[PDB]
From Swiss-Prot, chains A, C:
Part of the whole protein covered: 1 to 55 of 284
Modification type Phosphoserine: residues: S45
Gene this protein is translated from: Tpm1
Stated name of the protein: Tropomyosin alpha-1 chain
Physiological role: Binds to actin filaments in muscle and non-muscle cells. Plays a central role, in association with the troponin complex, in the calcium dependent regulation of vertebrate striated muscle contraction. Smooth muscle contraction is regulated by interaction with caldesmon. In non-muscle cells is implicated in stabilizing cytoskeleton actin filaments.
Biased composition (Basic and acidic residues): 12-38
Other known facts: The sequences of cardiac and skeletal muscles are identical.
Source domain of life: Eukaryota
Localization annotation: Cytoplasm, Cytoskeleton
Entry note about domains: The molecule is in a coiled coil structure that is formed by 2 polypeptide chains. The sequence exhibits a prominent seven-residues periodicity.
Quaternary context: Homodimer. Heterodimer of an alpha (TPM1, TPM3 or TPM4) and a beta (TPM2) chain. Interacts with HRG (via the HRR domain); the interaction contributes to the antiangiogenic properties of the histidine/proline-rich region (HRR) of HRG. Interacts (via N-terminus) with LMOD2 (via N-terminus) and TMOD1 (via N-terminus).
Modified residues (N-acetylmethionine): M1
From Swiss-Prot, chain B:
SS bonds (residue pairs): none
Described purpose of this protein according to its UniProt entry: Troponin T is the tropomyosin-binding subunit of troponin, the thin filament regulatory complex which confers calcium-sensitivity to striated muscle actomyosin ATPase activity.
Protein's name in the database: Troponin T, cardiac muscle
Coiled-coil residue windows: none
Disease implicated: Cardiomyopathy, familial hypertrophic, 2: A hereditary heart disorder characterized by ventricular hypertrophy, which is usually asymmetric and often involves the interventricular septum. The symptoms include dyspnea, syncope, collapse, palpitations, and chest pain. They can be readily provoked by exercise. The disorder has inter- and intrafamilial variability ranging from benign to malignant forms with high risk of cardiac failure and sudden cardiac death. Cardiomyopathy, dilated, 1D: A disorder characterized by ventricular dilation and impaired systolic function, resulting in congestive heart failure and arrhythmia. Patients are at risk of premature death.
Expression (tissue specificity): Heart. The fetal heart shows a greater expression in the atrium than in the ventricle, while the adult heart shows a greater expression in the ventricle than in the atrium. Isoform 6 predominates in normal adult heart. Isoforms 1, 7 and 8 are expressed in fetal heart. Isoform 7 is also expressed in failing adult heart.
Organism: Homo sapiens (Human)
Gene encoding the protein: TNNT2
Assigned protein family: Belongs to the troponin T family.
Length: 55, 59, 55
């Protein structure tokens, strides 16, 4: 009819916005966790270098 | 944000659209009521034509 | 009718799924970010003690 189509369009705009936000948040999590794990690896290498210096 | 104003805009769009939806609902509903009354007076016309035709045929 | 109900319910389900997924991702992002901050703070002190050791 008439109002039904507009209501469907609203329900679809919510769909697109929610899905896009979810995908963006997932990409953010991937990037942040990669950052953290690379920092942890750098910390490990520093520990090993400290061990060599102690020797 | 832009998402906020976009949301308010599609929101008022939904509001005006459902408003006009219920509006044409009511309009076509009145039209259907008028058409039903038309059918009713139509059946009245059928019955009156039937009885007067039958009287004519009796005579 | 029939089509309106199923389509509307499916679309609302899609919106809710995307929203909850985004919230989970953002929570993990915040936790990973704070842990990364901890890693930075500990790494600086590790570097300082390494520098003293080298001296």
């Amino acid at each position: 009819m008439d109002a039904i189509k507009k209501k469907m369009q609203m329900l679809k705009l919510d769909k697109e916005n929610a899905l896009d936000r979810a995908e963006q948040a997932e990409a953010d999590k991937k990037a942040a966790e990669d950052r953290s794990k690379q920092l942890e690896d750098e910390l490990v290498s520093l520990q090993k270098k400290l061990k060599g210096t102690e020797d | 944000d832009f998402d906020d104003i976009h949301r308010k805009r599609m929101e008022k769009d939904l509001n005006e659209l459902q408003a006009l939806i219920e509006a044409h609902f009511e309009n076509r509903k009145k039209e259907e009521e008028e058409l039903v009354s038309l059918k009713d007076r139509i059946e009245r016309r059928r019955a009156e034509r039937a009885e007067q035709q039958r009287i004519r045929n009796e005579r």
